[PDB]
C-alpha cells in the first residue's frame, strides 16, 4: 500500500 | 474556513475510523481504484481511494495542507472552485498512480499537492487573486517530492494543480  | 473544506475533512475522519474498526483491506477492498477492469463500472473508485488514510501522521499531515491551503480557495476562489480542484486531481493522480504502482494506495495527498501547485502559480501570476504561497512553503513541497509513497499521485497532482492555476491565470 502506497500513501498519496 | 468553509463547508467544503469541512465536508472533506469528516468524510476523510470517517473513513480512517472506519479503517481502524474494520482494518485497512476491508475498506480498500471497497474504496480503492478498480483492482480488476470488471469492476470499471464502480464509479466511487476514481474518488475514493483519496478518503482513505494509513497511518495518524499520515491523515494529520494531509488534512492539515488541506485545511490551510483548501479553505484558503473555498475563502478566495469559492466552494465550486476547490470542489474542481479536488475532483479533477483526485481522478488524475489516481489514474497516474496506479500505473505506476497498481490499485493499493490511498490519501489526499494528489489533491494536497494539485493544492499546493495551484495556490503557488495562481499567486505568482495573478496576484490580484488574493492568494499565494511562500517559498518557504514550496521548498519544504519540494523535499516531500525527492523524499519519495504514491509518487505517481504526488507528481500528477502538482501537474494538475499548476495546469488549472495557468489556465485560471490567464482566465
Known amino acids: ?4 | 474556513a468553509g463547508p467544503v473544506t469541512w465536508v472533506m475533512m469528516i468524510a476523510c475522519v470517517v473513513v480512517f475510523i472506519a479503517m481502524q474498526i474494520l482494518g485497512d483491506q476491508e475498506v480498500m477492498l471497497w474504496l480503492a481504484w478498480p483492482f480488476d477492469p470488471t469492476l470499471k463500472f464502480e464509479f466511487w473508485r476514481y474518488f475514493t481511494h483519496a478518503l482513505m488514510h494509513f497511518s495518524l501522521m499520515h491523515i494529520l499531515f494531509n488534512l492539515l495542507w488541506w485545511w490551510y491551503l483548501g479553505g484558503a480557495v473555498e475563502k478566495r476562489l469559492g466552494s465550486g472552485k476547490l470542489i474542481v480542484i479536488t475532483l479533477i486531481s483526485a481522478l488524475l493522480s489516481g489514474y497516474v498512480q496506479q500505473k505506476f504502482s497498481g490499485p493499493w494506495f490511498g490519501g489526499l495527498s494528489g489533491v494536497v499537492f494539485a493544492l499546493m501547485g495551484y495556490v503557488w502559480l495562481r499567486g505568482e501570476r495573478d496576484p490580484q487573486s488574493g492568494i499565494y504561497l511562500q517559498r518557504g512553503l514550496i521548498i519544504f513541497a519540494l523535499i516531500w517530492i525527492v523524499a519519495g509513497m504514491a509518487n505517481g499521485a504526488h507528481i500528477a497532482g502538482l501537474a494538475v494543480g499548476l495546469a488549472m492555476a495557468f489556465v485560471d491565470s490567464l482566465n
Open chain 1, 1 to 4: 500500500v502506497r500513501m498519496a
